[PDB]
Design a binder for this molecule. Sequence first.
Ligand SMILES: Cc1nn(-c2ccccc2)c(C)c1/C=N/N1CCN(Cc2ccccc2)CC1
Ligand SMILES: Cc1nn(-c2ccccc2)c(C)c1/C=N/N1CCN(Cc2ccccc2)CC1
Ligand SMILES: [Zn+2]
Ligand SMILES: [Zn+2]
Ligand SMILES: [Zn+2]
Lengths: 457, 457
Amino acid sequence: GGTADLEDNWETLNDNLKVIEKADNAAQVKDALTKMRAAALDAQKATPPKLEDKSPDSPEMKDFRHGFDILVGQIDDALKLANEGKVKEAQAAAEQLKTTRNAYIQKYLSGQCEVPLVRTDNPKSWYEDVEGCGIQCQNPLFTEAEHQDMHSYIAAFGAVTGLCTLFTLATFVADWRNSNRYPAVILFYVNACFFVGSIGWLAQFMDGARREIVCRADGTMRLGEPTSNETLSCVIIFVIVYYALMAGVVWFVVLTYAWHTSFKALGTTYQPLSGKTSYFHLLTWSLPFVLTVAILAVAQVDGDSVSGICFVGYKNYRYRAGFVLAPIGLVLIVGGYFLIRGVMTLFSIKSNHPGLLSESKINETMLRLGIFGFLAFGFVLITFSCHFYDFFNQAEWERSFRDYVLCQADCEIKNRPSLLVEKINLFAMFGTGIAMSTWVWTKATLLIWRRTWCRLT
Amino acid sequence: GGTADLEDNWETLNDNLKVIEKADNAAQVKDALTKMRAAALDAQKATPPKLEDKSPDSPEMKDFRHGFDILVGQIDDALKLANEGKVKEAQAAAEQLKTTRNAYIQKYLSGQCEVPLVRTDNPKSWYEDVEGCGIQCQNPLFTEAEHQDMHSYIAAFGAVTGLCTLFTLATFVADWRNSNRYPAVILFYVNACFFVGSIGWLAQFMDGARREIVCRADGTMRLGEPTSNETLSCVIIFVIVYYALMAGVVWFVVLTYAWHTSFKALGTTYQPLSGKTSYFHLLTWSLPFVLTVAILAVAQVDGDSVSGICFVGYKNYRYRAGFVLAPIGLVLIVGGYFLIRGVMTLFSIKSNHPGLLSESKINETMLRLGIFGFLAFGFVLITFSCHFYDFFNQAEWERSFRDYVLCQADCEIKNRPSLLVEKINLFAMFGTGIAMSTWVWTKATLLIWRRTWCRLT
Ligand SMILES: Cc1nn(-c2ccccc2)c(C)c1/C=N/N1CCN(Cc2ccccc2)CC1
Ligand SMILES: Cc1nn(-c2ccccc2)c(C)c1/C=N/N1CCN(Cc2ccccc2)CC1
Ligand SMILES: [Zn+2]
Ligand SMILES: [Zn+2]
Ligand SMILES: [Zn+2]
């Protein structure tokens, strides 16, 4: 529709977008934008090929038209700067139009592509035998109401864990000469991990970051990352999240180990852990590193719009068992062994030395530690179960997704993943940090912060 | 959001919209529009009250923002004219902003109103005990795909009937000295009616007319028309449609009557209808008039977005039986009587005068008439059945509509009307005209049009 066809004006915008990129003076930059503005306004007068059947006042026609409202405003912001002779930054403002261009060309000049498949020229983004279509970034199995529901749940829980574990780090360093002692300082490193994990989980809430993390440049979803031309954003969120949570679950095994061995103090001033502290840092930081490095090697980092992060085994449930179920499983056997070895010792001390737990100081932090070890084991047990549910059921959910994608070209989805199971899972993973941070919710912490403010007068 | 709240900037636009209406000079008109533009742009920066939960890039946020793109463009068209000192037409361009204002205030500053009920200050538009909400114009029981499907069906069929019956009128007047003879000229008046009916049915396809016909000024649907402040558009479409189709069904009874009585010619040059022609025009034009005048009296004209016209008994199935089922029913008993009286005569002539139907001229148009009478009776029989299905089932469809409206404040509709039954109905009502127009699809018509072009050389 209009003077020129929709595809013609879109090709005009594309050609002039590339001429700005390779332009020398403001005269040619200004020339492109003023011919681009004319094109956008003429393309706006048009009717897209699969919208002949739609009303002119329809939300589709109004949104197609709106794309050119966004584009003309952006053209004007670049046109203002090009008029200001500021070539450099005018080419930078013109680089913003590529976002609108890629989204609206995809939406309205879809071609052979029908939702959830989207128009993309990147052959690595193409789905099955379908030439030129890729699976849309936004998870087509979940509604906008459910996406927004998960985002709220993660924001609320992420922010709580974030601030709780941040305070516990602050309380520890505020009294580091005193608090940097084992087995107490284990909880500091556990809290460091959940804090770093939270930052990874809350990254999606930063203006437009969720798309930058989970979508490819072409609007298709992130798959088999690390991959060429794409940004590091996906893998950075993966590394932050996966390393931080895998390190934190190792420090949990360390906690259970420390609780079991600190029974050897016998209330007495002996330090059973003395000299063992070196291995604690070697195991907790080397073990998740080796795993992370291996995931980047196999390139099995995939993104999710509902989760908002990049993770291992989102598309391949096989890699999810080997890199999530297997470590969490193994942390439960080893951590579970030391807790059983801990209770065995407690009833052995109870028989051999009745009244040795007589009131305090050392004996008080001992049971607080054993409560934390059991409380954190319980949460690891819920995540393991949630991850297992996903693992043993993902094959059918993937077959239901193929059967829907392929049909969409009534047409509905048989089964899909459980957001309740993922929220139950998220609660346990955030709850391990919330519960672990309350290690510092002592009368002594009030003293630490009283002396901290006195020294800040 | 922004400098001022959404409601504040919308109130600013409203106040300045009224100041333009009561303005004296261009300076104050120009002053309002430039303060209106600032408001629209600031209101565009805002987030509507029930859209805090929605993404900023969401289609809702993009459409809310788009309303101000439409408004600013309209403001500029009025601002261009006000700058041109053309106060008169600037106030006329400013009058266009009332359309956008009413639609977007309704959509995004909905208040206590939840779809399908819409925000309206007109108390005559308010639904049940709900204070300030009215039932939306667009039929909430039918999807945008089904609305667009009915519109296509009516356009295709309306245009065919329209052109077929237009040609038959043209063929008749092109040879009026010859063709203005009974019983043939009855088909001309039958075709006149279907043509006028088609124009009534095709009015909805004129740029934005469908809304002007079926919606109240406040965006609620047309009900109990004729009613104060509203335009005549609804009632004009009703009168055109109802009178034209009710007159056409009376001319059908006249046809059946004429076929029965023209048996009294006996091939012979006697004109049985001679002098009876006066009553034919008295009955066919007075009878639908009396009915139309009575519908406007009881004020039972309601509009429909899926049908696109205004009609009797859309909301009250009772009035639909009395003004549609009752006349169509009665036209079937009287028209049916004369067809049975016609066949009775044919077999009486066959017995009393074997070989009187020996070949032509008068005997040829006689059977063509009896085929038309039976062919048109068949179609009246389908519409009667379709109207009856609607009548005896509308009470539950209305209870399902209340139960949905009231719930919407999952939530779905139990049962709704049948578009197949209405399309079957439409086919028969359009088909009566299509079949009736083929009266003129004779070898003789080619002669008429050959002599018409010769006289146009
Ligand atoms: C990723 C991911 N994505 N989603 C997820 C979220 C929303 C929608 C769709 C999917 C979920 C629920 C996860 C869970 N990851 N695990 C949780 C267990 N943790 C180890 C661990 C950490 C602390 C305590 C105990 C165990 C590893 C990461
Ligand atoms: C109005 C209306 N609205 N709708 C309708 C259309 C779409 C959706 C929802 C509803 C329908 C199907 C109608 C039907 N009206 N009758 C048809 C019968 N005719 C008398 C008649 C005329 C010629 C031949 C035989 C009979 C009176 C008007
Ligand atoms: Zn002992
Ligand atoms: Zn817009
Ligand atoms: Zn006889």
